[PDB]
Design a protein around this ligand. Sequence first.
Ligand code: SF4
Length: 303
Amino acid sequence: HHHHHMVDEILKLKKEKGYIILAHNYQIPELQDIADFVGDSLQLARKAMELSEKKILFLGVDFMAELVKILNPDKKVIVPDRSATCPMANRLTPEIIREYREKFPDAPVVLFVNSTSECKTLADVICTSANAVEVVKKLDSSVVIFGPDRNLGEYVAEKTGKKVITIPENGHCPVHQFNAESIDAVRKKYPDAKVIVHPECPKPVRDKADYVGSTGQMEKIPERDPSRIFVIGTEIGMIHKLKKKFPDREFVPLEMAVCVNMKKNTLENTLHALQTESFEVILPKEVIEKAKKPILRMFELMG
Ligand code: SF4
């Protein structure tokens, strides 16, 4: 295979230099295939608490790389592209969080994992798409401040019956803005297919799906649902993941949806990262100390 040179050297350098490679489900297939662990944000966060390797190469976006670092302050965490980020986070700021705390006195602040580490220092609890409902359900409050994703917060409100105040204004993931007409059309094309969508999708898409869940939840659905065809409403990288796990099922994208930031990582720049052991993820010690609290609370509210 024509990529063999990069694949072979990545595997050699990872072993020689003592790295574990963690990747998100939206990474390109070629990178998923060289990673030691590929999962959703919650699975990556849990893996980050467990792993023993002294050095971590993380393949995803910066806020998750930083979460890995927060949980492993004394390990070296590197990423191949230091600009890979989630655009939804930048609109959420400390000033907005403090404004809303005052506006809603005793409402806990629940931040989605795609948020700056600075913002996480101000959060009561972190969540991911997988556990947001569970986290908010278990909190001792009928009102929560939630951000940055409005769709996820609205889904949480539905599922919990609680008041969810979303910050900032119109925070959303462009990748998951499918139109529900795509579900109508695929219902006609494949009448027995099951439609699985991400909770970051807008409400009419969520409401027309058979299942709503994180990418890790999506991967578990075929363990219990014997359907021959699944239609997948999330970023295109998950198709490869699902097809690998379940070669005897068919996975159809709801629409083509690409996260440009997730695609910044390539075989070439991942090789360069292992050659140079760059770019290290570095945070102020104060940020680690403060942000770890709501991250650890997330795990306390699950189990
Ligand atoms: S897919 Fe959406 S929410 Fe996830 S990193 Fe990309 S822009 Fe952010």
